[PDB]
């Protein structure tokens, strides 16, 4: 009975989802996946499946889990220094101290796990979120799960 609720992996479809997720968890993991036309559904689901597995592995940390598409939240990318080294990219935000760390290993189960493990041990490099405030978040329709158009 005395177990915390299941993880949730939420697409960043509006500011309330993003800000509440980061304010209600000590750390929030933000994945910026490639545009759907780069991966299609199969490639996007490969990345989402990695996030879902690690969210379960780390469920006792009670972290938040967010994902978005390249270019869909440009101001968020800028505030996290994302966009210049391609996609996928990952940041972990500490909302309380308004700081973040970027994944520097592979966007894979092994690479993200090493990233998260360092964070669970609280021994990784951080930087202030750009401007010292939570970035503006734009409203987006949720991904329909298909391969995009074009």
Residue numbers in the entry: 270 to 419
The publication says:
Here we report the discovery of a multichaperone condensate in the ER lumen, which is formed around the chaperone PDIA6 during protein folding homeostasis. PDIs contain one or more catalytically active thioredoxin-like domains, which can reduce, oxidize or isomerize disulfide bonds in client proteins via a characteristic CXXC motif. PDIA6 consists of two catalytically active thioredoxin-like domains, domains a0 and a, which are followed by the inactive domain b of unknown function. The PDIA6 condensates recruit further chaperones—Hsp70 BiP, J-domain protein ERdj3, disulfide isomerase PDIA1 and Hsp90 Grp94—which constitute some of the essential components of the early folding machinery.
The dimeric domain a0 is connected to domain a by a long positively charged linker, and domains a and b are connected by a short five-residue linker that presumably restricts the relative domain motions as it contains three conserved proline residues. Titration of the paramagnetic analogue Gd3+, however, quenched NMR signals specifically in three structural regions, thus revealing three cation binding sites (I, II and III). Binding sites I and II are located at the domain a–b interface and in domain b, respectively. Taken together, the Ca2+-dependent phase separation of PDIA6 is controlled by a molecular switch in domain b, which is activated following Ca2+ binding. The data thus suggest a functional model for PDIA6 condensate formation, where the positively charged a0–a linker dynamically interacts with the negatively charged surface in domain b at homeostatic Ca2+ concentrations. The multivalency required for PDIA6 condensate formation thus results from (1) the high-affinity dimerization of domain a0 and (2) the transient Ca2+-dependent electrostatic interaction between the a0–a linker and domain b. PDIA6 interacts via its domain b with the nucleotide binding domain (NBD) of BiP. Importantly, the BiP binding site on domain b does not overlap with the interface required for condensate formation such that condensate formation and BiP recruitment by PDIA6 is simultaneously possible, as observed in cells.
